[PDB]
Amino acid sequence: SFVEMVDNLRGKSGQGYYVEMTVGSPPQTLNILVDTGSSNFAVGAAPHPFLHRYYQRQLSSTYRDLRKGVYVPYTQGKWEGELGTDLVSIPHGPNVTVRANIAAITESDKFFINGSNWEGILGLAYAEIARPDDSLEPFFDSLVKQTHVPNLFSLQLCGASVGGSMIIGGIDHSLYTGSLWYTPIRREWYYEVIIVRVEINGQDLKMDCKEYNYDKSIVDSGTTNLRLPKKVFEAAVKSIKAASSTEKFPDGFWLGEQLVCWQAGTTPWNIFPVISLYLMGEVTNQSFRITILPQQYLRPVDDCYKFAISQSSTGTVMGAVIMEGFYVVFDRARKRIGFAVSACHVHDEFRTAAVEGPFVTLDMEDCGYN
Ligand SMILES: CCCCNC(=O)[C@H](C)C[C@H](O)[C@H](CC(C)C)NC(=O)[C@H](CCSC)NC(=O)CCC(C)C
Q1: What number does the ligand 1 atom closest to the CA of 310 have?
Q2: All domains of the chain, ordered by start, with CATH?
Q3: Which of 109, 220, 302, 366 is an active site residue?
Q4: Catalytic residue list contains 366
Q5: Looking at ligand 1, which residue's alpha carbon is closest to its atom 27?
Q6: 339 to 16, 42, 52, 221, 369: CA distances (angstroms)
Q7: Substitution site in 9, 15, 38, 322 for ligand 1 pocket (most atoms within 8 Å of beta carbon)
């Protein structure tokens, strides 16, 4: 069953997690980044300095041209290309073949990463944010429509090269401990959720909770950092600075530009606070929390680190540094996202990442931004 899909992801820290796929007939093998923050399936289809291989449409007998161009901008990076369809498989996934939409990337800017080892992107979010428009059926919708694969998938992203699992069509219980806690998908475009409270080392940030979700909060496996709205970012950095005031850092560290180092084995983990994000729950006035350790938001790059919390102008993004602590279930069928402590969690001496509940939280709907 699902055991065949365990450990089917690889990657390099800060460079994304990818799964192996094949496109075309005969099968062309490519590594494809798993991106829950977008909805287009696209692959390099022309030579590029950072590509070791790419998709060759002329060598595939099942390729069909859709005679339509396409462009996709991301927070950082963008590409343009030609739309078409072809047959697609996932060797370490379910045993099926689907005809899916594919954008053949012909030109790009700051999209491909040198040394990343992936040549394409699998947008796993909903058609609502697909380009050129929502009539271009995303890959997972095609998968579910053409096969018996159930309408959900789950991601276990493991940090300190790295690996993980994408379980397509279900949940593998060997991959997490404790209970799964679910938060509603507020609207099916991004995987949008609602954050209802934030605490740092047990102290409430005490902001209007709308600020936490201004102008949206999303879960994105294709973003490295925890990215926070301007006002929230400032409050969070202020609190984290105060907790670590014992030591002194370059001011470019807090902007993610400069790294800090310590002698191997002497990283003062203790002076950096835990961060708790409370998410809206499944019953009235009920929430739960996920707690993040400094080992997650200080990304290893003697031991040197970069600050992996950064400022956003497009809402909160819960990226890899959040997901790495957890097993995350994208339960599209029941419009909810589940969190549990991952089997591959990192080890702090006196502290542990957690998913805990129930909590009572009043007026949660008012935390959503309009
Ligand atoms: C068309 C409408 C949908 C657009 N969606 C997005 O822009 C989502 C929010 C972001 C998307 O996941 C892209 C993926 C990347 C591979 C280009 N990520 C980024 O732009 C982010 C920008 C971070 S700003 C410090 N890139 C990274 O974190 C670097 C690591 C990645 C190579 C894994």
Answers
A1: 25
A2: 17-149 (2.40.70.10), 150-370 (2.40.70.10)
A3: 220
A4: no
A5: 223
A6: 20, 28, 36, 14, 23
A7: 38
